[PDB]
Amino acid sequence: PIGESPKGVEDGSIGKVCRTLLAKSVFNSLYASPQLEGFSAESRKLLLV
Amino acid sequence: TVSSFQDILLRMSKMQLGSSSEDLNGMITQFESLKLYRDSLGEAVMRMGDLHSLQNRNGKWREQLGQKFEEIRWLIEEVRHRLKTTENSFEQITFMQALQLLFEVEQEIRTFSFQLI
Amino acid sequence: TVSSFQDILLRMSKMQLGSSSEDLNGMITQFESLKLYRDSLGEAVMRMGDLHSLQNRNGKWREQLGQKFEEIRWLIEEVRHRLKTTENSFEQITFMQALQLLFEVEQEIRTFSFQLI
Amino acid sequence: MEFSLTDPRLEPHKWEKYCVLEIGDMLLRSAIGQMSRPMFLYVRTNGTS
Numbered sequence: 001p002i003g004e005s006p007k008g009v010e011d012g013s014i015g016k017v018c019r020t021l022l023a024k025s026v027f028n029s030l031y032a033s034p035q036l037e038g039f040s041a042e043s044r045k046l047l048l049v
Numbered sequence: 050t051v052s053s054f055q056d057i058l059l060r061m062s063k064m065q066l067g068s069s070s071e072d073l074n075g076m077i078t079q080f081e082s083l084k085l086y087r088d089s090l091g092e093a094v095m096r097m098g099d100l101h102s103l104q105n106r107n108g109k110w111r112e113q114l115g116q117k118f119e120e121i122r123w124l125i126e127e128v129r130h131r132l133k134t135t136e137n138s139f140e141q142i143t144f145m146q147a148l149q150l151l152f153e154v155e156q157e158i159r160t161f162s163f164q165l166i
Numbered sequence: 167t168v169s170s171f172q173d174i175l176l177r178m179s180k181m182q183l184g185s186s187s188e189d190l191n192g193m194i195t196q197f198e199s200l201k202l203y204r205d206s207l208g209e210a211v212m213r214m215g216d217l218h219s220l221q222n223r224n225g226k227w228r229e230q231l232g233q234k235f236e237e238i239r240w241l242i243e244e245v246r247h248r249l250k251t252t253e254n255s256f257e258q259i260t261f262m263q264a265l266q267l268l269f270e271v272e273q274e275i276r277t278f279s280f281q282l283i
Numbered sequence: 284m285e286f287s288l289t290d291p292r293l294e295p296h297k298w299e300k301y302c303v304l305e306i307g308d309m310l311l312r313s314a315i316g317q318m319s320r321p322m323f324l325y326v327r328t329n330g331t332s
Contacts, residue, residue, distance in 0.1 A: 005063050005256075006063055006064055006067040006068070006254075006256055007063065007066050007067025007068075008063075008067070050267070050270060050271065050274075053263065053266075053267045054267070056263070057260065057263055057264055057267060060256070060260045061260060064256070064257065064260070072244075072248075076241065076244065076245070079237055079241055080264075082237075083234070083268075083271065086230065086234055087271060087274075087275065090275065090278060091315055093227070093282075094278050094281070094282055094315075094316070095315055097282060100220075103215065113203075117203065120196060120199075120200070121200075124193060124196050127189060127192075127193065128193065131189060139177075139181070140181070143174060143177050143178065143181065146170060146173070146174050146177075147174060149170075150167065150170050150171070150174065153167060154167075154200065154204065158207075161207060161211070262293070262294065265293070266293075270318070270320075273318075273320075274316060274318065277316070277317065277318075277319070278316060
């Protein structure tokens with residue numbers, strides 16, 4: 001499960017997962033800001049709960 | 050452009066199995082109508098290349114036809130004079146056969162030229 | 167007729183072997199050219215052109231242009247209004263892509279129609 | 284200064300720190316036909332670190 005769509009959720013293969021992770025890292029690099037790290041930490045705690 | 054149609058249709062297909070607004074059934078058909086019209090229009094404007102090429106070839110034959118008539122005429126008078134100026138039966142037999150062949154071929158060329166226009 | 171060609175050619179060849187004349191050689195060359203032209207003309211005769219494809223469907227095809235233009239700006243205005251009203255992101259991106267697609271395709275259709283007429 | 288093919292004022296709130304220009308036409312070579320779409324230029328001021 002890697003995507004969303006109206007009336008349902010969508011699926012993909014391993015290549016989609018690797019490309020998505022690479023794109024997430026690249027956009028993390030291009031748009032750095034303190035807001036990002038604060039949100040990341042707090043959302044990590046909530047996700048663990 | 051053609052691939053864009055497939056993406057647009059695939060994404061609009063998923064707004065109908067999750068919602069109403071029959072307007073997504075009213076726009077999802079006009080789109081396929083335009084697709085069919087465009088890929089029909091394609092080969093039609095594609096064919097115009099061959100037509101003008103075909104027309105050009107029909108211009109050269111019309112101008113060889115001109116030169117062939119003059120050749121036939123001149124050779125007719127020359128062979129008639131040679132027939133008039135000879136005194137050997139072999140030659141007159143050959144020239145009889147010639148004149149017959151020239152008349153037949155001239156008639157056929159005239160008929161074909163009339164047909165071409 | 168072809169038999170007449172080869173017979174008369176052999177006869178003139180034999181006649182010229184015993185005596186040389188300017189006109190004789192001239193008619194020999196002209197007869198060879200005429201035989202070749204007849205052969206090529208007959209080769210074109212049993213084939214003709216493709217007039218069957220020259221008279222394909224062309225009548226209404228000239229008039230659905232106005233019909234398509236009828237529904238071009240109608241659907242473009244519908245998409246514009248629907249993009250303005252909507253509130254999701256899925257629908258927004260779909261409608262923006264659709265608007266781009268129609269702009270490109272209608273420009274292509276107009277250019278193709280202008281070139282062909 | 285950057286080249287682009289996307290026409291502004293189709294979604295103008297995205298670009299509010301740009302001045303856009305139209306600088307020519309480009310021939311889109313395809314299997315059939317000739318497109319001749321316009322070409323734009325994006326201008327901006329900046330300074331990094």
